[PDB]
Design a protein around this nucleic acid. Structure first.
Ligand SMILES: Nc1ncnc2c1ncn2[C@H]1C[C@H](O)[C@@H](COP(=O)(O)OP(=O)(O)OP(=O)(O)O)O1
Ligand SMILES: [Mg+2]
Length: 425
DNA sequence: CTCCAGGCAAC
RNA sequence: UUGCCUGGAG
RNA sequence: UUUG
């Protein structure tokens, strides 16, 4: 059955190569992704047998404290590389059982479905007159997930008793803190490969309830938001869904993240909207600030690397960043931050020329007139003040950086948009 | 379509 | 987890 | 370090 289908040779190697590819830090054992291929070849006849025999206890997941963009400490769960390999092999065969019957409005942790699908449907709601959204988020969602309510949802379709025991065992596997197992009464491990599927299984009933109620919503993981026409209707259904998920699913709601405010002052998947009747997608202020704070140090504060290297690092990140923020319909702000990127990249190039004599000889080399070369070189104004002067725009400008190998942000923004909406449409 | 090296994003 | 992007082998 |  399904467990035999999980322990199949080809389902194990594809699951293995994934855990290998991720290059995740090692579990409680300390055995890495690099040692995983050699490791399982040695112990498979055992591991296979003892979990075919229902005598396989998985290792406890390892506690790591990582800071979250909000400022909170995210408690991550890191399983043993074998446990990651197994959980992957469960996930791979559990996806086709559960995924097809998941909501059409469910966009988080599902294959063939991205944040862009969630935002395009969301703009539809404010597009068609539902100009109030009830944005929602759960407190420590993965940490609070209820074992009995989860396995009840899991057991509905999954008839093989062997996998239900196995999945419960992974949920029940305690964690390690300074050399002691701490029993997990609540949660699915953050970073467990299977855990994101289990998360959608629980909130599939939340989608079915909202679908029964006949509401116009978009869910990505716990971050779930319903579109209504009025604030009163939104505030009414804010309490009624809070009552639902608190009683039926047994979860507590994050009131700081949850709100009934207007769509374009709230952030949804790194995007926000415009107050317009045809609400255009814009970058959320956080999303802009995260870019700026990343580009500030790709630009040299006191950083000693090759300038061509810096241009490659600045470009590979920006080009990757815009790959995901190509959805926004405001090119103006993209043109501004691109200029700000160049202006930021001028500061590092200016400071590199430590000597007043080195400034003069390079600027003359760049082609700038000798009149302007001696004026700005002897400036008594600050570094950031000199970067925004007429001279350094002329010598080091859009022409210069583009020739020095810098990839244009706005150029690629259009290149991506043009081809892609030619396809879907 | 499969998989490798690397990157970006949402969680 | 998932989506995407550059490069590579089939 | 820092997982999924
Ligand atoms: N980097 C990550 N690795 C693994 N799981 C993650 C990661 N980021 C987010 N998740 C998962 C687990 C989280 O419980 C879930 C929802 O994200 P989020 O709401 O930001 O965190 P949270 O619900 O655990 O804390 P909070 O109470 O602040 O919402 O998404
Ligand atoms: Mg949450």
């Amino acid at each position: 059955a399904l467990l035999e289908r999980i322990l199949a040779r080809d389902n194990l190697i594809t699951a293995l190569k994934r855990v290998e590819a991720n290059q995740g830090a090692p579990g409680i054992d300390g055995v890495s992704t690099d040692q995983l291929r050699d490791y399982i070849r040695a112990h498979w006849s055992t591991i296979h047998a003892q979990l075919l025999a229902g005598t396989y206890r998985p290792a406890p997941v390892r506690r790591v404290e990582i800071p979250k963009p909000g400022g909170g400490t995210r408690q991550l769960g890191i399983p043993t590389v074998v446990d990651r390999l197994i959980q992957q092999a469960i996930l791979q065969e559990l996806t086709p059982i559960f995924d097809p019957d998941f909501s059409s409005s469910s966009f988080g942790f599902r294959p063939g479905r991205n944040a862009h699908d969630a935002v395009r449907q969301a703009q539809g709601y404010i597009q068609e007159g539902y100009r109030y959204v009830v944005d929602m988020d759960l407190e420590k969602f993965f940490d609070r997930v209820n074992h009995d309510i989860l396995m009840s949802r899991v057991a509905r379709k999954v008839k093989d008793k062997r996998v239900l025991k196995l999945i419960r065992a992974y949920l029940q596997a305690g964690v390690m803190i300074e050399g002691v197992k701490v029993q997990t009464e609540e949660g699915t491990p953050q970073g467990g490969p299977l855990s994101p599927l289990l998360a959608n299984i629980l909130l599939d009933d939340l989608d079915k309830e909202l679908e029964k109620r006949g509401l116009k919503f978009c869910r990505y993981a716990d971050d779930c938001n319903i579109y209504v026409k009025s604030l009163r209707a939104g505030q009414r259904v804010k309490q009624s869904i809070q009552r639902f998920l608190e009683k039926t699913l047994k979860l507590k709601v994050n009131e700081e993240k949850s709100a009934v405010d207007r769509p374009w002052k709230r952030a949804f998947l790194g995007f926000s909207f415009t107050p317009e009747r045809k609400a255009r997608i814009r970058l959320a202020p956080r999303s802009i600030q995260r870019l700026k704070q990343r580009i500030r140090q790709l630009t040299n504060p006191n950083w000693s690397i090759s300038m061509p290297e810096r241009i490659h690092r600045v470009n590979q990140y920006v080009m990757g960043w815009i790959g995901y923020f190509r959805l926004v319909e405001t090119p103006s702000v993209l043109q501004t931050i691109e200029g700000w990127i160049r202006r930021r990249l001028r500061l590092c190039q200016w400071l590199q020329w430590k000597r007043v004599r080195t400034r003069i000889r390079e600027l003359r080399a760049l082609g700038l007139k000798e009149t302007a070369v001696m004026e700005i070189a002897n400036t008594r104004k600050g570094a950031w003040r000199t970067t925004k002067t007429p001279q350094l725009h002329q010598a080091l400008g859009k022409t210069y950086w583009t020739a020095q190998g810098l990839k244009s942000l706005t150029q690629r923004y259009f290149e991506l948009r043009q081809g892609h909406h030619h396809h879907h449409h």
